[PDB]
Amino acid sequence: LTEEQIAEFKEAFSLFDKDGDGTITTKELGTVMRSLGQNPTEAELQDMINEVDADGNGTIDFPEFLTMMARKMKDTDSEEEIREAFRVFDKDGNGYISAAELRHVMTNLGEKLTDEEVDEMIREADIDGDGQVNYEEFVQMMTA
C-alpha cells in the first residue's frame, strides 16, 4: 500500500463528509449531488447508500467507500443484468441490436442520452460500422 492512492480517496471522501465525523449521510451525499446540478430525491439517496452500506447503519463509512470505488462494474451479475437490459429491446432474440434501434431506445427513453453521449456509445458499440451491435460483446467490453 502506498500513500499515492490513499491521498485521492481520502480527499474525495472529505468532500462528502463535510462535517468530518467519518461518515456520509443522505444529506451530505445529496448536497454534493445538488452542487453538481443534480436534483435527487431522498428515496434515491437512500437507495444509493443502501447499495454499499454493508453494516446497514444507513450511512457510508470510509471502508465501504473504498470498497465501492474498487468494485465499480465488476459485480459478477453486472454483465447479465446490463445484457438482459439490452435483450428488452432486441425484439428478435439474435443477441444483436441495430445501431439505429439502440440510438432510438437510448435517446427516447428515460434518463435520455445526450446526442453526443449516444454518438460516442454507438461508435464504441458498432465496431464494424454496419449498424449491428453484438450487445453481449459490447457489454463484455464495458464490464472490463
Partner: peptide
C-alpha cells in the same frame, strides 16, 4: 489541486447510480 478529488467524486456518484439502476432492473 482539487481536480483528482473531484473526478473521483463524480465517478463515485456514477457508481452509486449504476448500482441502483441495477437493483431496480
Amino acid at each position: 489541486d482539487i481536480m483528482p478529488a473531484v473526478k473521483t467524486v463524480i465517478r463515485s456518484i456514477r457508481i452509486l447510480k449504476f448500482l441502483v439502476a441495477k437493483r431496480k432492473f
